[PDB]
Amino acid sequence: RPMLQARLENLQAVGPAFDLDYDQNRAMLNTLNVGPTLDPRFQTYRYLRTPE
Amino acid sequence: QEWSSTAITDRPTVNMLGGYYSQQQFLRNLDVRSNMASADQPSVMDEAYKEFVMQLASWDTRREFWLQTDYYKQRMVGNSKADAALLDEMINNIQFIPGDFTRAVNDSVKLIAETAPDANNLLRQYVAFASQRAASHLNDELKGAWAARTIQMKAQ
Amino acid sequence: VMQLASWDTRREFWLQTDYYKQRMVGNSKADAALLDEMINNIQFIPGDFTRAVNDSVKLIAETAPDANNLLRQYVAFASQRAASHLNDELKGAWAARTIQMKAQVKRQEEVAKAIYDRRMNSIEQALKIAEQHNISRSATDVPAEELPDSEMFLLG
Amino acid sequence: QEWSSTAITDRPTVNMLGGYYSQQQFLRNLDVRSNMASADQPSVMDEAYKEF
């Protein structure tokens, strides 16, 4: 009885066990939730013959 | 008079793409870990240049550029039919000749205007306009992909 | 090769060289015509690996020593431009890589801190429960440390 | 009178595909741990454009 009750109390107070993959996913989700930084007017081309 | 001018373009560099290159690299790295579909896909530069080329030769881009070029607005008689015909003619003025990699020739764009300085200024403005439109479209695509990835990660 | 075949490189080289400055007439149209004429004086013939023919460059000038010196200087100029562009691209890639590495290090630090906090909380709860149940025996179970955090209280 | 007009279309992008893209990607992710599919499969937008 004492050890079983202590096991129940400890597992109740600790909570579910999460592996490293869950923590890595949470960390990545934080940066994803930060949101992308959008900047316009960046060129998508380079000139080989400038118009004249 | 029909003065003509020619421009030749190629893929941009890493340094001129700005932060979009880093954001797309981050998204591709995320795609590498899960939903493996890289298969040595074309780099970000190729995608950006493909979008720019697509926006360069599109009829809609030429029409929208001419509608605001401030050089077409001066030649407006006020009749709808005449304005439409002139707009169609000037849209046909701008031509795009795709390049062939086998013969080492690049993509070129040719513009025809009425005066010599206008054959240069209008071509520069048109290229800038197409680049800006391609950049906006790429930003929208990046936002959509980012939202989809965020939703997938939340579900996982 | 791309720098060699580009129109812009030829135009800038001819503008920089002394072979063209001494031939300036002072009239803008005449100078532009002369520059455009001397642009075509440099022809790049791409090579084919199948026929074992390499890339070649031909320059045309009024005098043979000029026809040699100008070609040498133009090749050096193209090489310098290519080197500068390559250095800029390398710097951009370096900046992207260091940004990515910094982000990855930050994420790893956050993960480590989260795991440490979870273990601290588990330690505190186990201490409280062991105090409550008065299990002061240091040795309670055969298995050594690295026990699962669930039944972690089985210690003095 | 016989008047005529012309239109030119191309493949859509992720943004205009709406929520269907996420569902299809989820199904594809479920379909790469079972009944192996080709890694270089045509993308969702390509299939949608082909259907269109």
User: What is the SS3 assignment for D1-52?
Assistant: CCCCCCCCCCCCCCHHHCCHHHHHHHHHHHCCCCCCCCCCCCCHHHHHHHHC
Query: What's the CA gap between B135 and B141, in Å, rounded?
Result: 10
What SS3 class is residue B99?
coil
Is D32 in Cβ contact with B152 (below 8 Å)? no
Query: Which helix (DSSP H) or strand (DSSP E) does residue B14 occupy?
Result: helix B14-17
Locate B74 and state its tokens: 């001066």
**Residue from C89, C99, C150 to probe the interface with A (highest A Cβ count within 10 Å):** C150
Residue B105: what are its φ and ψ, rounded to 5°? -120, 140
Q: Please tell me the number of Cα atoms within 13 Å of C77 on its side-chain side.
A: 19
- Residues 6 or more apart whose Cβ sits within 8 Å of residue C71: C57, C59
Locate D23 and state its tokens: 């569902």
Backbone Cα Rg of chain B: 20
Q: Indicate the resolution in Å.
A: 3.2
What torsion do the CA atoms of B130, B25, C83, B106 make, to the nearest 10 degrees?
-40
- Residues 6 or more apart whose Cβ sits within 8 Å of residue B19: A37, A39, A42
Please name which of C42, D39, A36 lies closest in space to residue B27, comparing C-alpha atoms: A36
Residue B11: what are its φ and ψ, rounded to 5°? -65, 145
Backbone Cα Rg of chain A: 27
Q: What is the DSSP string of C63-108?
A: SHHHHHHHHHHHHHHHHHHHHHHHHHHHHHHHHHHHHHHHHHHHHH
Query: What's the CA gap between B67 and A21, in Å, rounded?
Result: 54
Locate C61 and state its tokens: 């000038």
User: C115, A23 in Cβ contact below 8 A?
Assistant: yes
Handedness of CA D37, D43, D49, D52 (dihedral sign): positive
User: B133, A43 in Cβ contact below 8 A?
Assistant: no
Residues from chain D contacting residue B34 (CB–CB below 8 Å) = 29
User: B32, B42 in Cβ contact below 8 A?
Assistant: no
Q: Check CB contact of C106 with chain B, cutoff 8 Å.
A: no
Residues from chain B contacting residue C32 (CB–CB below 8 Å) = none
Query: What's the CA gap between C55 and C49, in Å, rounded?
Result: 10
Calculate the alpha carbon distances from D47 to C78, D10, D27, D42 in Å. Answer: 45, 12, 14, 7
Experimental method: cryo-EM
- Chain C, residues 22-81, CB within 8 A of chain B, namely 46
Min Cα distance C64 → chain A (Å) is 28
Locate C57 and state its tokens: 């460059």
Query: What's the CA gap between B90 and D46, in Å, rounded?
Result: 33
